[PDB]
């Protein structure tokens, strides 16, 4: 009866496998292709965990259903995301748009998203739905300001944070908030988990951006500087700008049609920099803000699992 995460994730994964079956064959193969090439299922994880501080002595079906919904919405995002970025590989295999075609991927994304809505109707509180829906809207308008920001060397840090909040933190925040609201937790514990999740999410994304310069063409399943090659000016790059007026002008002149060597030069400068570490540092401060609040929660196995999971999240590198 001691909650086992591994075991919990499989129950959500099996519920995802059924949910993906379709009257249309290709949509089924595409969804399964993506589902099985596999990712870390963090969102479903935070939902299960976030519900142990409520009033259910065991995880209810209602919470497994929100977990299934969250991963399906996440997936819809990934699929449409690879169509927009002309991306090549996702989770180590071909993105849908490349294994089939562009029409298919767009359709699969709609499919995945519709299923997510079907599955959220297992929640009964009409305020959660209003909460989850307005959040998805912010996510999307976020994704738009980011595409619209592409190669803008004049953007500010306070503005990069607002961008990773809508883009990534927001759905981790919903995973922890709703997960508690499903097992009837109280104002405080929920407010507590809403905040814990939001901080993990901010740290989460900051880490991705750092790992885009420090990782490997192989472990990243993509170049490196990848985000810069697409014009995304992330935390590491904003930091090196404020303290390096040469690099700042070097970034002001940067755009898609620039020669691969001006890029190489840029991504090569960020690495021997302190900025990769100042960035990592912000991730860390963010993680402590989360660990502090996790402590203020009741002792037990759940609190031990969240503490454990929140500690890998940061001490990660892939």
């Amino acid at each position: 009866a001691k909650l086992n995460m591994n075991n919990e994730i499989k129950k959500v994964e099996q519920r995802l496998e059924k949910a993906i079956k379709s009257k249309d064959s290709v949509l089924e193969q595409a969804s399964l292709h993506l589902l099985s090439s596999g990712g870390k299922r963090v969102r479903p994880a935070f939902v299960i965990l976030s519900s142990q501080f409520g009033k259910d002595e065991q995880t209810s079906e209602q919470t497994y259903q929100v977990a299934v919904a969250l991963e399906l919405i996440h997936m819809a995002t990934l699929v449409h995301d690879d169509v927009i970025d002309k991306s090549d590989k996702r989770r180590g295999k071909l993105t849908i748009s490349k294994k089939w075609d562009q029409t298919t991927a767009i359709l699969t994304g709609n499919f995945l998203l519709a299923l997510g809505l079907e599955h959220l109707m297992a929640v009964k509180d009409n305020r959660v739905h209003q909460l989850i829906s307005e959040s998805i809207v912010d996510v999307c308008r976020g994704e738009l300001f980011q595409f619209q920001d592409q190669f803008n060397s004049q953007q500010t840090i306070i503005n990069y944070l607002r961008r990773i909040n809508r883009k990534t933190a927001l759905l981790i925040q919903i995973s922890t908030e709703v997960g508690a609201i499903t097992s009837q937790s109280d104002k405080e514990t929920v407010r507590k988990l809403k905040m814990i999740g939001h901080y993990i999410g901010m740290s989460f994304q900051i880490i991705d951006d750092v790992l885009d310069f420090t990782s490997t063409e192989k472990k990243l399943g993509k170049p490196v500087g990848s985000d810069l090659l697409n014009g995304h000016i992330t935390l590491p790059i904003l930091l090196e700008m404020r303290k390096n007026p040469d690099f700042k002008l070097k970034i002001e002149q940067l755009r898609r049609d620039s020669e691969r060597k001006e890029f190489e030069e840029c991504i090569q400068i960020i690495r021997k920099s302190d900025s990769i570490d100042e960035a990592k540092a912000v991730s860390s401060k963010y993680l402590s803000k989360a660990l502090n609040l996790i402590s203020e929660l009741p002792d037990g196995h759940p609190k031990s699992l969240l503490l454990s999971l929140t500690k890998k999240m940061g001490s990660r590198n892939t």
């Binding site: 306070i158 944070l161 607002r162 912000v282 401060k285 963010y286 803000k289």
Partner: peptide
């Protein structure tokens, strides 16, 4: 704590949209 700052500018703009 620069994060002291920021996380509340966001907070405010989430109310006074």
């Amino acid at each position: 704590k620069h994060y002291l700052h920021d996380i509340q500018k966001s907070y405010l703009k989430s109310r006074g949209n």
